[PDB]
Amino acid sequence: VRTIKVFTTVDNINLHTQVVDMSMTYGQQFGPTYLDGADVTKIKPHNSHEGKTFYVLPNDDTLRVEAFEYYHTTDPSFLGRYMSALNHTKKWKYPQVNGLTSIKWADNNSYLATALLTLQQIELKFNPPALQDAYYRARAGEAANFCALILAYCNKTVGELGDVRETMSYLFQHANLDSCKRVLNVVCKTCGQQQTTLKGVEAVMYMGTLSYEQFKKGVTKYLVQQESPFVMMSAPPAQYELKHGTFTCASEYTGNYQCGHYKHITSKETLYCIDGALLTKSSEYKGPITDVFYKENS
Numbered sequence: 001v002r003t004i005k006v007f008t009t010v011d012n013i014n015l016h017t018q019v020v021d022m023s024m025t026y027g028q029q030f031g032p033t034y035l036d037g038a039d040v041t042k043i044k045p046h047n048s049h050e051g052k053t054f055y056v057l058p059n060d061d062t063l064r065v066e067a068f069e070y071y072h073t074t075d076p077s078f079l080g081r082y083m084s085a086l087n088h089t090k091k092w093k094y095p096q097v098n099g100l101t102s103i104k105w106a107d108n109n110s111y112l113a114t115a116l117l118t119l120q121q122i123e124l125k126f127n128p129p130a131l132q133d134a135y136y137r138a139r140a141g142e143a144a145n146f147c148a149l150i151l152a153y154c155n156k157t158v159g160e161l162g163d164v165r166e167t168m169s170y171l172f173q174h175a176n177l178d179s180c181k182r183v184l185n186v187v188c189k190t191c192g193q194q195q196t197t198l199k200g201v202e203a204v205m206y207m208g209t210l211s212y213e214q215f216k217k218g219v220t221k222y223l224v225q226q227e228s229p230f231v232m233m234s235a236p237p238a239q240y241e242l243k244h245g246t247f248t249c250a251s252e253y254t255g256n257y258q259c260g261h262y263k264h265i266t267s268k269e270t271l272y273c274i275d276g277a278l279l280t281k282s283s284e285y286k287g288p289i290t291d292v293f294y295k296e297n298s
């Protein structure tokens with residue numbers, strides 16, 4: 001009986017040595033099995049596979065606990081959707097553009113590149129170790145796994161049309177924002193003190209206008225107190241002037257002929273427009289902006 005030793009895992013942190021019979025498929029021995037995202041369930045082991053790490057579905061209590069501790073989801077479909085995405089995202093190119101990890105365009109991923117760029121410019125503490133780990137890898141240039149996880153957590157497949165604001169929101173719902181706060185106070189003549197407080201993720205997002213200045217001035221009429229490391233402001237795509245130094249980064253969205261495309265604008269020493277692998281510098285920017293992000297900087 002020919003055999004090799006492989007490692008199985010659900011988290012790539014805890015590795016479980018296995019002895020595999022080379023005359024049977026991985027599926028026969030492990031159930032659904034993946035090698036770097038590729039479905040090798042129906043494949044017989046190769047000698048090149050010796051010593052390699054394979055992902056498996058959490059079929060026992062031990063693996064189920066390891067998966068829950070790493071991903072913080074009980075969805076039994078997660079790992080398979082994660083692997084399905086990783087098989088694609090591993091083949092994407094991740095150029096460094098103006099000091100940030102971006103993604104060369106493929107598979108309708110402009111929204112993911114724009115989200116990835118934004119995530120590198122705001123302070124976020126992810127709760128699932130899987131996201132915290134891959135976040136720090138992506139920030140160092142190895143972003144394939146992070147992108148595959150974003151797709152899995154957002155319940156989106158490679159190639160599906162995506163929205164930066166949505167993606168950011170759903171990632172925020174996997175972060176520790178417990179200390180973020182927005183207090184709204186009613187401006188009235190005869191209604192007394194009327195106040196409501198948004199804590200957590202609701203505090204870091206707003207829909208209706210792009211301008212933080214207008215929002216802080218007031219929004220029937222409300223005085224606002226904002227306490228968060230960042231805020232995401234979104235509005236319908238509209239021609240909008242981005243002035244250097246007045247924002248951290250922004251999403252541009254065009255919908256010519258109903259085929260959308262995102263670009264990312266970041267404010268450094270001047271305005272940089274990152275469009276996947278492409279980089280364009282300018283002193284002024286006017287375009288159809290739909291998200292603007294602002295950083296508190298303590």
Ligand SMILES: COc1ccc2cc(C(=O)[C@@H]3CCCN(C4CCCC4)C3)ccc2c1
Pocket residue numbers: 161162163164165207208209234235236237253260290
């Ligand atoms: C009242 O607050 C808002 C805030 C944002 C708004 C945005 C849109 C958009 O069109 C998105 C632009 C960005 C791109 N997505 C598309 C991406 C794929 C699916 C839709 C579409 C429309 C209305 C909005 C209203």
